[PDB]
Design a protein around this nucleic acid. Structure first.
Ligand SMILES: [Zn+2]
Ligand SMILES: [Zn+2]
Lengths: 363, 307, 144
DNA sequence: AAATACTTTCAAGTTACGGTAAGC
DNA sequence: GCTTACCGTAACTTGAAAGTATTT
């Protein structure tokens, strides 16, 4: 199961992931060169090379001597000539120091760095929770649904690392969407007063087969409509199949690298998943099991402020209101109750008001 | 292409019909992501709107010699180009929507009448004061001018809330303050940044300065030459930016005479207050050969005390 | 990556010309052009990581079979040097695919086969110091 | 109509001030 | 009478994300 290119530079032919992992483990673990243990030595390592490399001991000693590491002012660019990279870096640094008054780590750069590298090198506090030596590591990309206008041109995404031996549902749980917290009923003449976790039923779509969530009784099934419609008369998408999500783990999932699979949850909210770059577990990454899945990338979405104060964040959204100049006008908790109620609900009758859990504060 | 809907018929692209949870969720009242964004209208849109409204809104003579003043729905909106026009034009409404620059004299009446009226029935006051505005604009002005929506005073009980929130919502060095202000009652991002960075941090040190700290601060300043105090803060062991700046400028400078006053420096200070101003002390200290910014203010207060 | 491939090909050609390969002879060039100062530009953390991974990936690319027998050994030396002198706290690592490993091992054993133990011990030490990431494919993949 | 640009906003901060409640 | 840390806001500032006037 050699994973090669199907399309020229962008796509990979399908392959059973578990067979790939077993292929690496069998091909490589025989020499004992993948392990998760952090680190007369000289002549003993010399005998080790003379027995493994199988060169006469003299050559091993000569090489252990002449190779070394020393043969091959820290943050200062010297005058070194034959380095185009150093020349360009020096020019940029000079132009930067002559054109800036306050230079430091910006908010976006520190955000992305401290998000990506904030768990590496960690160790399990318990001893029975450490990850295995041969389990895989899969990087998945989950695109955001469109929330602003600009997301229609340069759509963003979020990334999270998921092991190769844990079930689908442990990634289903950990995909963070705001559409699991929407509560908006219709509060118009009642200003004071369950969430969108009343009905939870989602599914994956991997290489033609649907994976449904039938753990707890609800309106569990959600892939029935597509099966009914898109293949009886369309004649355009071949044949689909079902399989309960909580039964399969990531090794069983025959997939492709760099293809837009699907994840639909809470009715019609759909995220496009683009898996990429599966590898083996190293001894540097966070060696644990209760931290996976964990996200290593995210988006710094804006936040909406109330249209009147312009100082707090929106909490109530009013539709078809006879006061505001715009139809979907948002408000804080002070503007709302100070402008829309005369000590009583619905100052003016033609007026709709709903709670508004904004995404910028919940991401 | 693959965004929404993911399943689209190759020939047509309609997409699969509605789900069951989808129809139930829409019937409940929950709003999609696309329902909370609305496109704004460009200038040409407003021009076309107005001219269509004018065109829509002896008698044969009356038609054609009509002045543009007197004249100034589905048919127009659909055929020519759909309820935002019914609100945009009714609320842009050239004849009677005039949010001119707010002159100072109307502000006092608005504030006093709003306070006396109970801060309620904004349509009623916006029709009572006869201000040629809407109810919304009066509230917006009253809120922007309001001086009772913030706190500007840190108590004991809210420092702990700040600490708990910033310790449960701190990933690495990234500290998102706006989400905290959402969870923090009656504050905003500026005040939380101030408090956490300057006073409330557990790491920082609060106390007197020993001579060794003074020597290190002098070396750091001589390295950096009285700029970029956020870099200087590193050399001094834990002291904040504000502490270093204030201490060096107004306490430790190489030549800033301090102690009791005399007659002559009093002479210069009194004349200079009567000349460069009384409400600002930066310039008053700037001309004064020895004393600093704070010392001039303190001395003026002591003068008032003596009088 | 401001034109690394220019310097990389400069050093690799200046070492091709010798036809006397040995780590006694590559280190001479490594210190005569002082290619070890390429990581002392006073950079931040993100640019440091990106630059290190780009340099290591480029050297790896130059190591692969579709080159001569002369470029490959010099690129192996370059891999060794770059991985050993990079200034990172969690040192960035080179990226090996799956379709490459069999031929890489074949080349290594052929090189050991005839008294060329220099590059042999270099590669053995790279493998032994846990410097690799064993991935399905070299570069991250995604439609766009 | 796809593609390209320029100018807005948002959210970390950083700096320069005005005062305070203390100290001998 | 003096000094000394603390206190808190107005206004700049770096730069990606998001708007949006113009191109062929
Ligand atoms: Zn979602
Ligand atoms: Zn408000």
């Amino acid at each position: 199961n050699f994973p090669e290119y199907e399309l020229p530079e962008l796509n990979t032919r399908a392959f059973h992931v578990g067979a790939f992992g077993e292929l690496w483990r069998g091909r490589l673990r025989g020499a004992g060169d993948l392990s998760l243990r952090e680190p007369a030595d000289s002549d003993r390592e010399d005998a080790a090379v003379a027995r493994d490399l199988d060169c006469s001991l003299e050559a091993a000693a000569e090489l252990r001597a002449v190779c070394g590491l020393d043969k091959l002012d820290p943050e200062v660019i010297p005058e070194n000539t034959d380095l185009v990279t150093l020349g360009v870096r020096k020019r940029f640094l000079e132009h930067r120091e002559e054109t800036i008054t306050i230079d430091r780590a910006c908010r976006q750069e520190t955000f992305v760095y401290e998000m990506e590298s904030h768990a590496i090198g960690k160790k399990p506090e318990n001893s029975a929770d450490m990850i295995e030596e041969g389990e895989l590591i899969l990087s998945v990309n989950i695109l955001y649904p469109v929330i602003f206008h600009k997301h229609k041109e340069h759509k963003p995404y979020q990334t999270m690392l998921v092991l190769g031996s844990q079930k689908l549902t442990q990634l289903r749980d950990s995909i963070r969407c705001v559409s699991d917290l929407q509560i908006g009923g219709e509060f118009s003449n009642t200003p004071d007063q369950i969430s969108k976790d009343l009905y939870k039923s989602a599914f994956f779509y991997f290489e033609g087969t649907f994976y449904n969530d039938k753990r707890y009784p609800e309106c569990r099934d959600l892939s029935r409509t597509i099966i009914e419609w898109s293949e009886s008369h369309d004649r355009g998408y071949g044949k689909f199949q079902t399989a309960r999500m909580e039964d399969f783990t990531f090794n069983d999932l025959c997939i492709k690298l760099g293809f837009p699979y699907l994840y639909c949850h809470q009715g019609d909210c759909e995220h496009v998943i683009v898996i990429t770059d599966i590898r083996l577990v190293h001894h540097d990454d966070c060696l644990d099991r209760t931290l996976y899945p964990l996200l290593i990338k995210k988006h710094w979405l804006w936040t909406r402020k109330c249209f009147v104060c312009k100082m707090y964040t929106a909490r109530w959204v009013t539709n078809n209101d006879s006061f505001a100049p715009e139809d979907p006008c948002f408000f804080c908790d002070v503007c709302f109750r100070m402008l829309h109620y005369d000590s009583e609900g619905n100052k003016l009758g033609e007026f709709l008001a709903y709670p508004y859990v904004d995404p910028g504060t919940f991401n | 292409h693959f965004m929404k809907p993911y399943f689209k018929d190759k020939v047509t692209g309609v997409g699969p019909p509605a789900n069951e949870d989808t129809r139930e969720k829409a019937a409940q009242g929950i709003k999609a992501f696309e329902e909370l964004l609305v496109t704004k209208w460009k200038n040409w849109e407003k021009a076309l709107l107005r001219k269509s409204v004018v065109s829509d809104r002896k008698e044969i003579q009356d038609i054609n010699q009509l002045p543009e003043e007197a004249l100034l729905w589905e048919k127009i909106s659909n055929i020519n180009f759909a309820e935002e026009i019914r609100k945009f034009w009714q609320n842009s409404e050239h004849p009677s929507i005039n949010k001119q620059e707010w002159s100072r004299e109307e502000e006092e009446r608005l504030q006093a009448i709003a306070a006396a009226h109970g801060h309620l029935e904004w349509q009623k006051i916006a029709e009572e004061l006869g201000t040629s505005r809407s109810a919304f604009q009066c509230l917006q002005k009253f809120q922007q001018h309001n001086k009772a929506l913030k706190r500007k005073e840190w108590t004991e009980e809210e420092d702990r809330m700040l600490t708990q929130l910033v310790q449960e919502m701190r990933v690495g060095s990234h500290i998102p303050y706006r989400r905290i202000v959402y969870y923090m009652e009656g504050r905003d991002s500026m005040q939380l940044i101030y408090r956490w960075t300057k006073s409330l941090d557990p790491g920082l040190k609060k106390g007197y300065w020993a001579p060794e700290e003074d020597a290190k601060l002098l070396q750091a300043v001589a390295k950096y030459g009285e700029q970029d105090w956020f870099k200087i803060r590193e050399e001094v062991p834990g002291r904040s930016d504000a502490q270093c700046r204030d201490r060096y400028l107004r306490r430790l400078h190489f030549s800033l005479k301090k102690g009791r006053w005399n007659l002559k420096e009093e002479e210069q200070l009194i004349e200079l207050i009567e000349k460069y101003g009384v409400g600002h002390w930066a310039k008053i200290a700037s001309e004064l050969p020895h004393r600093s910014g704070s010392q001039c203010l303190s001395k003026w207060k002591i003068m008032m005390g003596k009088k | 990556p401001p034109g690394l491939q220019t310097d990389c090909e400069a050093l690799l050609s200046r070492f091709q010309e010798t036809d006397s390969v040995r780590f006694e002879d590559f280190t001479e060039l490594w210190r005569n052009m002082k290619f070890g100062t390429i990581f002392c530009g006073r950079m931040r953390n993100l640019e440091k990581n990106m630059f290190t991974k780009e340099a290591l990936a480029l050297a790896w690319r130059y190591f692969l079979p579709p080159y001569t027998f002369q470029i490959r050994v010099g690129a192996l030396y370059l891999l060794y040097g770059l991985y050993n002198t990079q200034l990172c706290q969690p040192k960035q690592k080179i990226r090996v695919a799956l379709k490459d490993w069999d031929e890489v091992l074949k080349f290594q054993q052929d090189l050991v086969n005839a008294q060329h133990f220099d590059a042999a011990y270099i590669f053995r030490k790279l493998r032994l110091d846990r410097a690799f990431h064993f991935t399905a494919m070299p570069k991250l993949l995604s439609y766009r």
